[PDB]
Structures are given as structure tokens and as C-alpha cells.
Design a protein around this ligand. Structure first.
Ligand SMILES: Cc1cc2nc3c(=O)[nH]c(=O)nc-3n(C[C@H](O)[C@H](O)[C@H](O)COP(=O)(O)O)c2cc1C
Ligand SMILES: Cc1cc2nc3c(=O)[nH]c(=O)nc-3n(C[C@H](O)[C@H](O)[C@H](O)COP(=O)(O)O)c2cc1C
Ligand SMILES: Cc1cc2nc3c(=O)[nH]c(=O)nc-3n(C[C@H](O)[C@H](O)[C@H](O)COP(=O)(O)O)c2cc1C
Ligand SMILES: Cc1cc2nc3c(=O)[nH]c(=O)nc-3n(C[C@H](O)[C@H](O)[C@H](O)COP(=O)(O)O)c2cc1C
Ligand SMILES: O=C(O)C(=O)c1ccccc1
Ligand SMILES: O=C(O)C(=O)c1ccccc1
Ligand SMILES: O=C(O)C(=O)c1ccccc1
Ligand SMILES: O=C(O)C(=O)c1ccccc1
Lengths: 332, 332, 332, 332
């Protein structure tokens, strides 16, 4: 594979149609899904030349750990839908690549099993029925060695995925929520923050004042995100809010972004707009569906090469230098 | 049906071509018809997270009545063109859904019959030949229990609908104006205002100074509208003037908008731009053509679900909160 | 015919391909040809409502004559290419419609014959070899009763029309320049101005300072124009410069525009941007090719109806009112 | 041939697919390749009228030599890929046309042989392994009569060309680097500047501060360029940075641009945005592939005619006048 798009076509061949649709789809008319790509494609980088590139490194420090790339695997529920080894295959490849892996509340393998793979994983939280049960998941994750709590804050309930409705899609018998909901509020965030010493990362922030409030609330990071266009149809892409949010936060927390990152060049664009790091969702599942653990390994090796390539061509010996790049909006 | 677009395809199958064209078409090159959709698609919402959604309500108070949604059925003449029960089917479904229904001057069932359905209806006025006859329609409507007069102000005469011309379209023998024209002016508006205690709503305002003058003239509301692209071809979409008009009116009257509203997400966009409520026209007729009263019921139930979904995903427990959402223009 | 586009299709059937290409084509990649349409389509009118329309008139006074519409027939050379009656057919229809007709220097019927048709015609000048011969054409035109000199100022030489090159197109034996070149300069303009009491109109102005200089030079009007995309490929559309030019001239001369005017709605857009009047070129030749004099009559009757329709729907009882309309740029 | 596009189609027929792909392709998704064209197409010229065109000249003085056009042949490696006479054919045609030719470090004919053709050539430098060897190439070029050193500064390494990867493309046995790499830095530039009295031209500048630093570093010129979209995928087109860079440099060095120049009209656009001259790459190779030396001659004759045509139609008797033209961005 020489691009991430090679993997999508590979995954479309192997996966049952309704499972491919569950993976690919968005809510409503899929306007926000498409806009995630359109918005990235409008961004152009202004590269710098003639800088010292003797020691180009793509590494970052985030949430107390060195990562090999400014990237983590996004939370994607029920990964056994895509391959029999599910989350274990993905976590093993992420570990080997030096990339953080986000364990889901709705993982199809238990969080303790996935954490035992190693690789200093993160844990994504869905707010439950009950403050007490929510906090027990958090404590489980922490006890198992997870290093950050990625609190999903854009799912008071799940969006209307019309492909799934039309397909009559439901979980197969053989896929379960192996770790086993009410709308989260700022009170929920405070309950989590008080219950753990781990950094709390709020995933799904788009409004500038919600980013500011996240810092005020003691968040260690946010993910600027419209949930891959799967939640509010018509929600602005995260990439379009990122610059404004980075300015408003003024270094008070890590600012990640996701939605449609499909190459090292896209990672460079996100960094140039001010992101600390990106999450990548669907492409990791394409790789998993296509070729299991080895597929995810190949994807991460490709992304690593593309990120190094893009950084050097843009005159950046470090991710910090890439954040100081300027950009220009074009038309496509 | 899981989207409004499902209903358009259903209606295209059942309706005679020339009747579908009468319904779907615009004036001239249909530039303003298409622009109504293009303009909505360019609007993106910036949703808020982590707000209290224990008691989400889509209700509003408007013109002295509670409505179940920030939506009314737009005036559409001659509804027996689309189904034998015509206006009665639509008014019954609107009543049952808690949605105001606008009775037309050119209704194919008499306004008194439609009003007897109940549901606290509105009445749309075409200015007639004669101040005295115009005012008699208004008095009839008021006597029959209509709760607002929706004065159409963008039809000094009807626009040039080229589909209708090419089709040689005319009313069938079996469809008549059951309630049985000169250009309206500001004098006409004053005559109506002096003749009724009902709120007068001016439908078809696009210029900011006409919105201001509407308030000065004693209007209780306006509908920011290019008449679904059926009047001046090249008229700006209402959705593109809405923000400016809401600012200029500064709460002096209700500001509604119509043109291309095709989902709860579109309703959210209109509200975020400052609308009090929307009108929906063609989709209600698609539902009527497809399945009569039950079709319109299903459409309104779908819209209700989509509006609740969109509001909650955007962190809005009330329509007032949705009006305080910010937006960002994108490219499509 | 119910639109101008009906006539283009009619003309494509009857005309030899290479003659249709001579008519339709532009220079280079035809970027400026296409941009004339794209630019008009981006303009939206903000119509006014509820104004007195008891005496709507589309008439204007220009260059000392009343015209029935804010429109004249553009200069198009060699009209016998399109119909055997050529310029006589077009001039007769223009006369009957009350529309000025521009007689070309390269007319295929002599200017005296065309002037004898009546209808108070204009005369378009190509600068010749020789100040003396150029001025003799001007004097001929004036002696024959022409009422304005339309000096073409954007043709120091003719543009590169690649359709014509590829077709190997040349004038048929049966078409000649019946009135029988060097680049014009500001000196040429002064020579013409000193030689006639007729208003001199400079056709092909796009730069704001050239519009200002035209007024300083004693021009009675200008046509803001890129010559229908037939001269510099990449020249900005006139419609995109019109507002700026109207502001700069501040009433010092008439400001006309041409390029892609294809409906009464387009005329309204041009007027709302500040034009005194428009020229229409290719559509008049479509009508001529399709049905001779009667074709041109039908075209002008259609345009008259569309202009009246658009003005009234926009609340304008006069062309002066239409010039005070505001506009908004959209996306298409 | 009547356009440059005629030559691309001619070249596609004759060349092996993988060689055509090597020539045509870009890096990554080819976003920057496409954007070079999209950006030029958005630029419109505001032409001037009625100026003296008695002595229109397309000549410029640059780097101490008169050139017949504001254009040079871009450096393109390995020209024997496209025709057996390779660089000699192109250099002979450039000489005969009065156009500078850029001899490549990776030329498939030795730089001394190509220089012996005459025509006062330029030499493009790839920074080598070794300051000493790099400087020896420079001295060779200077000794052979090259008149400028075009230091490529946007290739710390080569970009990822996916067409080449997918094709498994490599140099044929019969093509070699007849003159026979480390990332260049500002230190490398200074080493070159100190080693030659020839003007040093930095090719591949996009950031305004890199243009400023180039002047500070003693560069005689820069080429504002994203390397034809072959290096960083997502790099802004040079044409989009050109105006800002010309303002920042304030006459301190020559500012050239390349990327997608495909007509004399495009040359005019570049000049109107402030360029001293353009480079043309792929079209010269199309002409070479299509018809060898005579093909390149025909291409340069066509470009000369198109540049003269465009300048005169825009009222410019000299390239300096063309630089004073204004432009307007449109939509396409
Ligand atoms: C199939 C699927 C399942 C997902 N499950 C979750 C989830 O459980 N929790 C969460 O916060 N986000 C979830 N997401 C959202 C992703 O974390 C991510 O925000 C989104 O996919 C955008 O990134 P992408 O374009 O790289 O896929 C899911 C996305 C997909 C496609
Ligand atoms: C078939 C049809 C008939 C209409 N009749 C009327 C009418 O009698 N009075 C009026 O004010 N608007 C009338 N309208 C305009 C609508 O009230 C509304 O402004 C327009 O359809 C835009 O909304 P939509 O895109 O939701 O259809 C009509 C529209 C249609 C399509
Ligand atoms: C076939 C043809 C011949 C023309 N001949 C002339 C001419 O002789 N003099 C002139 O000033 N313009 C000439 N024009 C330009 C037109 O007057 C006008 O500026 C142009 O066609 C743009 O208007 P349109 O889009 O309505 O055709 C010609 C245009 C065409 C298509
Ligand atoms: C096949 C090919 C080989 C090239 N080789 C070089 C090179 O050796 N050195 C260099 O500085 N640029 C090289 N370039 C870049 C060109 O000089 C030029 O910047 C680019 O092609 C953009 O111009 P165009 O759109 O006119 O082709 C090459 C381009 C192509 C297509
Ligand atoms: O988060 C999601 O987008 C998603 O599709 C999902 C669906 C079911 C359970 C958890 C997440
Ligand atoms: O209002 C309309 O758009 C419309 O189409 C119409 C047609 C006839 C009578 C009333 C309204
Ligand atoms: O003016 C023109 O555009 C044109 O096509 C023309 C061609 C020959 C003679 C006069 C005008
Ligand atoms: O510069 C280039 O773009 C290019 O394609 C190339 C490839 C091999 C050697 C030198 C240049």
C-alpha cells in the first residue's frame, strides 16, 4: 500500500456491505462527513526551505509519554466487527509502532485484556446510567494501566445513521460489549476529574467557549471533532475550528483534532493549524479489515513515512516547528 | 421514511408529471430555487456540549399559541391537486402534530371547512381586486377561528414558471378555488392591520429596510422568503438575508424563514441564524401525494424527531438556546 | 420561445457548424466567455416589496432618444452569415421594438441602407488605417442619421479564436464588408470627438481609470465589456467591474455593460449593479438565424416581457428604481 | 498546434505510459499539481485600452542578458527519456528562440555539450554529498559559459510520486546522469554565493520570510514554486504567494514563478502579479516528445505569439507595463 486510500478499497472487498456502511457512514445527509474532507483539502501549507534536517524527528511528548508520531488511534467501538482479533490486533500494532491506542468503553474485547498488550493505552469513556458505574470504568482503566481518560462529550445520545437504518443493521451475535447510558454534563466531567489523577481529555469540542471551559474545568486536553460526521449532521468540521480554539486555549491544554485525516500531509496540515496531535479512525479499521494486525502495522508504517516526508519537505525538524508553519486557504 | 427525500421519490412515482412539475418548479432558470438549497448547505452549526438535556423541548409560543415545533405548514394553493382529500388531510395531520397550518386564499376546500378541522390554523391572504373583498376574506378567516393573517407580499403578479408553460399546465376541471387580484402595497397592509386584531405576518420580505418597515407598519411577524424560487428568478434566498434582518428588527416582530427546509438539521440552522420558526412547503405536499393524511402525519413525526435530535446533539434544551448557537459558512 | 436558451438550440440546428462556432466562440481557452455567465449567475437581487406598480415602465432616455427597454442590439459584424436578410432583418425588428440597433463598420449591408430602415440607429466604429478614412465613416454615419458613435476600444487587433482556426473559417464569397485597420489610441478618441456632435461611446472599458479617463476625454458613454470573451482570454467580465466603474464615473457618462445577458432577470442584475443599459449580442443572432426578422421580433418581445416581469417582482416601477436595488453575491 | 494543450495530446500518444506518468505526475494525491492550474484559472486580468502599441516588445533583461520573452525553460532532469536528442534538441530550440535554457545537474547529456550549443544557458544545481563536489559542478557550469546558477532549494529529498511507485518506474539502461545528494541549507547557499560571481537564483521559495532571507543572503533571484506539485503535496501554489513575495522583496532580486504556465495569457497573469519572468516545464517536454527540436521550436513560437497577443490586447507595450496591470480573483 502506498496511500491510505489503497486500504479503503481493500477493506471494501472483504467486509460485508452493512458492516462497511456502519464504518463509513455519517448521520443525516452525511454533510459533516464530506465536509471533514473538503475542509482539509482547502488547506495549503506554506513550507519553509533550507533548514537543518540532520535529525528530523516525528516524536512528541503527550500526557506524560513519548509517542512516535503526533497521532493516536481514535476510539472505534466493536472492532471484532472488522476482524476476528479485533482490538487486540490493533493494540498490538499500535504498541509496536509507538502510537497510543484508545480502548473503548464499548470494546468487543475487555479493557484489561487490551491493556495487557502493553503500549501505554488510553481509555475512552461513555457516560453511563450512573455516576458510580461510570467512575468504576474509569478506575478499572486506571488500575489496568491506561494513561489518559478520553471522555466523549458529543454523544448525549447517538446520531441518526441512515445507512444503518436502511440496512437494518445490528450487532452480530458474536460481537458483544466485553466490558459489561445518560447524557454527560460539565458535572460529569468534574466527577471524573476528581476521581482520577490521569489527564482527562474531552473529545468532541467544537465551540471556542467550550474549549475555554474545558481548560477551566481542569481538562488536560481536548479533541476538536465532529465525531467523523456521525453525530450532528451540519456540525462544523473540527479542522475549521482548530485555529481559533488553539488561540483561545493559549497552551492551557493539549489540542487534538480528528476527522478525515488520511495522510501524513493531512497530519502536517493539522499541526500547522496548531494541533498537538491527531486521531485517526476509519483508516485504522480499513487496515484491520484488510489484513489484521499486519495490516494495521503497514498502515502505521506508511503514515510514519508520510509524516516524516511531509515535515522534511516543509523544513521542519520537529513537530513544534511544524506547528509554526503558516497556511493559506485555497479553492478546490 | 427516514428522511424527507424518501417522500419526494414516493411523490414523483404517484403524481402526474405536470402536477409534479407545478409543485417542484421555480421561475425562470430556477436559479433561486437551487440557491435555497445551496445556501442552507453552506451553513454549518457550531454545537455546544455538556449542557443539561433532562427536559429538551421543541415547543415555541408564537402568535399567542403554543406550537409543538418551531415550524408551520407553508401556504400551498390547490392541495386537491396532490390528493383527493387535499387541504383537509393536511390540516388534520398538522392539528394532530401540534403544528400550525396555513389556509390559502386559493384553497381547493373552503377556509371554513378547513378551519372546522380545528388545530388553531392561520390564513394566507392574496390581495384582491378590491379592498372591500380582501377585507371580507380576512373577516371570514377571523370569524372561522384563524389566528394569524399571513399576507403574501411578494406576488404583485405570479412569476413565470417555465415548466408550467412548456407543459401547458392548467387547473383540472375537478380543482377549484373553493373560497370564491391586484398588487398589494403598504397601503394594503395598513388596511388589513386596521381591520383585524389578529397578528399580520408579511410573507416574502427580503430587503432589510422592508423588514424594518414591516415592524413600523405594525406587523406581528415576517417570513423571510423568495417564495421557493417561484417569483423573481435571481432573488436572494431568505436564509442568506435572515441574520441581517433579525439584527435589524431587534425583537420587534417574529422573524420566520422558508425555502428548502428539508430536515430537522435545516430547522436548527434556521434557528441558529435567528429564525423564530420555519415554514415547510413542498415536502408537506410530497407526503400528502404519497400517502394522504397518514403521509403528512409520518412526515411531521419524522421532522419532530429530527428537530429534537439536532437540538440535543447541539446542546440545546430549548429553541431559545438554539437561536443562541453560532454558525460558520463552509464550502460545498 | 419562452427563454433565450430556446433560441440558441434553434440556431444550432439551422446554422453550419463553422458559422455557429464563429458566433459562439471566444479567444484562447474561452475562460472569459464562460466567466461572463459565471459572474452573472453569482449575482442575486434583493427585491423590494409593496411598492406602487400602477405604471411600471421599462423605458429609458439615452443619448437623446427614448428607448423601450434598457437595452440595445450589440454590434455584431457580418450578419448575412446568419440569415440572407442579415442586418436589415435585425434593424427592422429593433426599430419595431423601440430598441436601438448598432450598425457595424464591418456590416454586410451598407450603413446607409440599414439606417434607411429607420429606428434611430447607432454606429460602431473600427479605427481604420487612416484618421481621414475613420472620420469619413463617422461622417457617413452621422449624415445617414445615426445617433451615437460606438467606438470599439478593445480591438487593437482581433483576438485568437481557436474554433475559427481549427475550422479554417473564413468569410464566404457571398458575404462582404459592404461599407467598403490600425490600433486606436486616446488620440483617436479625441479625433472622433472633435469631428462629430454625436455622443461618443467607448466600448470595451474594464479598468476603473480608463472609465475615468473616458469621461475626462468627453465620452458620452462607455460599455463595460470584455468583448464577449473574444479578445483577451483572461480579461475580467464587465459585470465584475461594473459597480466600481459606476461609482468612479459618478454620473459623468452613461455606463452600459454587456457579456452574457440572457434574460430580463440578467438585465435587472445589470441595472441593480448600476448599468444605464445593456447590450445583447449572440442571442439576437440566434433569433436571426432561427427565424429572420420575425425571430428577432419574438426575442425582443420575450425580453421585454421578462424585463417588465423582473422589475415588477422586484418592486421597481422604473429603471431608475431598479438601479437603486441592492445585490448580494452567492455561490453557484 | 494552436495551443499548448495540442502538444500534451501529441506527447501522450508517442510516449510509453510510465514515462508520460513520470512527466505528468505529482506527489501524494496530486493536490498541489491540480492547484497550480486552479489558482491560475482564478486570476483575471484587468486590461488597459487605447495605449500606444507601435513598438510592442516582449523582451526583458535578466541576469545580464536580453531574453526574447519573459520566460525560460525550467530544469527538467533526464530529457533523453522523451526524445533521443534530449537536452540538445531543447537547448538548440531555446537558443534559436532567444529563451534561456536551464541545464540540469541530472541532465542526460553533459553540461559542457549542452552549453556548446550556445544561447547563454543557465545551470540548475542539486546539492551533493559534499560541499567540494557541489562547488565543482558550479565551477564547471561557470567555465562552460552558464550565466546563472539555479539552486534548487525545495528538494532536501525527492517527493513521493505515487504514479512512479505504482508503475515501478526506473531509469532505462540507456538514460544516465551524464554529468557524473544531501539536503541544502542556508549555509549551502552562502558556499555557492562565495564561489561564483554568477547570479544565484533560489528555486522553490514559497514563504515570504524565505524570500526576504534569499535577498539578505545575496540571491540575484528566486523562483516562487512548489516544484510542479512534485515535492510537498499540499504546498501552496507559487502563483498564490507571488504578489505577497514581490511586495516583500521590493525590487531586491528578480522574482520568477512557475507551475502550470500553459499559455501567453498565463504569462500575462504571472507578470500582472509581479513576476519578472516565468519558467515552463512540462509543455517543453511535450513538444520535445512530440517532434524533437522542431516541436520545441513550434512551442516557443506559439508561446511568443500568445504573449505578444495578450500584452497588446491588455494595452502593454512592454513587460514592465504588464507588471503594472491589476488583477481580480474570480470563481471558476
Ligand atoms: C465505526 C465507528 C465507531 C466509533 N466509535 C466511537 C466511540 O465509541 N467513541 C468515540 O468517542 N468515538 C467513536 N467514533 C468516532 C471516532 O473516534 C472519530 O472521532 C471519527 O471516526 C473521525 O475520525 P476519522 O475520519 O479518522 O474516522 C467512532 C467512529 C466510527 C467510524
Ligand atoms: C405549489 C406551490 C403553491 C404555493 N402557493 C402559495 C400561495 O398560494 N401563497 C403563498 O404565499 N405561497 C405559496 N407558495 C410558496 C410557499 O408558501 C413557500 O414559500 C415555498 O414553497 C418555499 O418553501 P419550500 O422550499 O419548503 O417549498 C407555494 C409554493 C408551491 C410549491
Ligand atoms: C460574431 C460576433 C461579432 C462581433 N462583432 C463585433 C464588432 O464588429 N464590433 C464590436 O465592437 N463588437 C463585436 N462583437 C462583440 C459584441 O458587440 C458583444 O460585445 C459581445 O458579443 C458580448 O455580448 P453577448 O454575450 O451578448 O454576445 C461581436 C461579437 C460576436 C459574437
Ligand atoms: C519530469 C520533471 C523533472 C524535473 N526535474 C527537475 C530538476 O531536476 N530540478 C528542478 O529544480 N526542478 C525539476 N522539475 C521541476 C520543474 O523545474 C518545474 O518547477 C515544474 O515542472 C513546474 O512547472 P510546469 O507546471 O511548467 O511543469 C522537474 C519537473 C518535471 C515534471
Ligand atoms: O461513536 C460512534 O460513532 C458509533 O458509531 C457507535 C455506535 C455504537 C456504539 C458506540 C459507538
Ligand atoms: O404561489 C405560488 O408559487 C403558486 O404556484 C400559485 C399558483 C397559482 C395560484 C396560487 C399560487
Ligand atoms: O468583434 C469580434 O468579436 C469578431 O468576431 C469580428 C470578426 C471579424 C470582423 C469584425 C469583428
Ligand atoms: O525534480 C523532479 O521533480 C523530478 O522528478 C526528478 C526526478 C529524478 C531526478 C531529478 C529530478
Amino acid at each position: 500500500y502506498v496511500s491510505l486510500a489503497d486500504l479503503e478499497r481493500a477493506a471494501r472487498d472483504v467486509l460485508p456491505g452493512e458492516i462497511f456502511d456502519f464504518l463509513a457512514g455519517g448521520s443525516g445527509t452525511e454533510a459533516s462527513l464530506v465536509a471533514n474532507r473538503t475542509a482539509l483539502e482547502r488547506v495549503f501549507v506554506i513550507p519553509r526551505m533550507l533548514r537543518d534536517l540532520t535529525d528530523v524527528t516525528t516524536e512528541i511528548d503527550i500526557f506524560g509519554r513519548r509517542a512516535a508520531l503526533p497521532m493516536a488511534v481514535a476510539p472505534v467501538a466493536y472492532q471484532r466487527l472488522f476482524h476476528p482479533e479485533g482490538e487486540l490486533a490493533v493494540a498490538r500494532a499500535a504498541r509496536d509502532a509507538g502510537v497510543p491506542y484508545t480502548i473503548c468503553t464499548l470494546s468487543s474485547v475487555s479493557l484489561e485484556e487490551i491493556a495487557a498488550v502493553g503500549g501505554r493505552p488510553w481509555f475512552q469513556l461513555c457516560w453511563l446510567r450512573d455516576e458510580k458505574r461510570s467512575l468504576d470504568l474509569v478506575r478499572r482503566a486506571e488500575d489496568a494501566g491506561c494513561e489518559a481518560i478520553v471522555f466523549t462529550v458529543d454523544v448525549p445520545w447517538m446520531g441518526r445513521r441512515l445507512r444503518d437504518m436502511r440496512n437494518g443493521f445490528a450487532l452480530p451475535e458474536w460481537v458483544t460489549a466485553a466490558n459489561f447510558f445518560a447524557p454527560a454534563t460539565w458535572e460529569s466531567v468534574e466527577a471524573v476529574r476528581a476521581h482520577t489523577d490521569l489527564p482527562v481529555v474531552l473529545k468532541g469540542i467544537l465551540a471556542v467557549e467550550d474549549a475555554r471551559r474545558a481548560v477551566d474545568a481542569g481538562a488536560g486536553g481536548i479533541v476538536v471533532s465532529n465525531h467523523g460526521g456521525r453525530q450532528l449532521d451540519g456540525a462544523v468540521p473540527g479542522i475549521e475550528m482548530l485555529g481559533e480554539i488553539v488561540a483561545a486555549v493559549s497552551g492551557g491544554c493539549e489540542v487534538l483534532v480528528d476527522g478525515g485525516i488520511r495522510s501524513g500531509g493531512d497530519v502536517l496540515k493539522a499541526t500547522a493549524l496548531g494541533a498537538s496531535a491527531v486521531l485517526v479512525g476509519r483508516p485504522v479499521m480499513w487496515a484491520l479489515a484488510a489484513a489484521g494486525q499486519d495490516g494495521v502495522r503497514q498502515l502505521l508504517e506508511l503514515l510514519a513515512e508520510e509524516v516524516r516526508d511531509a515535515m522534511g519537505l516543509a523544513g521542519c525538524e520537529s513537530v513544534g516547528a511544524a506547528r509554526r508553519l503558516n497556511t493559506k486557504l485555497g479553492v478546490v
